């Protein structure tokens, strides 16, 4: 076990830790003089889910236990840390890329001629986001928080829902079909990419 943060998934970096300590003997009875770590059997390739940093971190420290009571409460501990980077290839091509095309294709609703076509297609688009949200959740790991892919999905829901409002608003706004606001075929991609950029800095 180790504290693992998968928020930047699939571009997350993890630390695989090993902590070793004598079970019954303090550092006055048993102490670690040195630690040597070998990871040669692990060799990085494109066929590996994780990529190691190669330079493993090793340490020997003294752990003081509060519940214990002349310095008979310190234990010698070995700590080994192996830095790994996730291989994001599979997730970029089979998840992020098709999601982009789906979201981009949702902006094409502003190119339909009639209000009826624009509003009805929005529902098929909403159904496409739901069908996609599931495809991802069924494969991506279970987490107690949202990843980067999870946020894209929410943006898709927002983009389609916001489009629905503009499609209706444009229709019943004028005193007698605001086809000018319908020229927002550019405002949605830009406004979306703009919101997309400010979301990257959050991680």
């Amino acid at each position, epitope marked *: 076990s180790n504290d693992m943060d998968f928020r930047l998934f699939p571009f997350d970096r993890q630390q695989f830790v090993l902590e070793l300590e004598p079970f019954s003997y303090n550092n006055q009875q048993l102490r670690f*003089s*040195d630690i040597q770590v070998y990871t040669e059997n692990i060799d990085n390739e494109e066929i590996d889910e994780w990529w190691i940093r190669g330079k493993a971190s090793t340490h020997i420290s003294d752990i003081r236990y509060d519940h214990l009571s002349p310095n008979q409460n310190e234990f010698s501990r070995i700590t080994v840390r192996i830095d790994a980077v996730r291989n994001p290839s599979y997730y970029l091509w089979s998840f992020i890329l098709p999601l982009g095309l789906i979201i981009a294709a949702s902006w094409s609703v502003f190119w339909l001629e009639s209000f009826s076509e624009r509003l009805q297609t929005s529902f098929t688009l909403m159904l496409t986001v739901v069908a996609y949200a599931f495809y991802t959740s069924n494969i991506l790991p279970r987490l107690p928080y949202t990843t980067v892919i999870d946020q894209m999905i929410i943006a898709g829901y927002g983009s389609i829902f916001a489009a629905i409002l503009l499609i209706i608003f444009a229709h019943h706004r004028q005193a007698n079909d605001d086809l000018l606001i319908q020229r927002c075929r550019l405002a949605f991609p830009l406004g979306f990419l703009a919101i997309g950029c400010v979301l990257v800095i959050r991680g």
Partner: nanobody
Amino acid sequence: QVQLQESGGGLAQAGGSMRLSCIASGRNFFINIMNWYRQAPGKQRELVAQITRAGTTTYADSVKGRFTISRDNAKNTVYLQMSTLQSEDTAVYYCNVGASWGQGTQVTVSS
């Protein structure tokens, strides 16, 4: 597989001083304890001085007050200052880290 390379040694003067040094090198290691051993011609290998990462030192009774151990933690380098030398100090001095040993440097005190 930690490599230890001792430096210094040779002929020394009774009542004089000599400084030995040892460099530890390798891949993925962390040293907590660095030692200096010596083995007299027909005696057993004995611990002379020891230093922890925290800097706490301990010496054999025969060398206490005369010898001084020091270290540069970052450089994995240990030193032994052998002051007010005596004929008994004649031995092969070994640098040690766990199961790793230096080649052994001969120190011969002459009077």
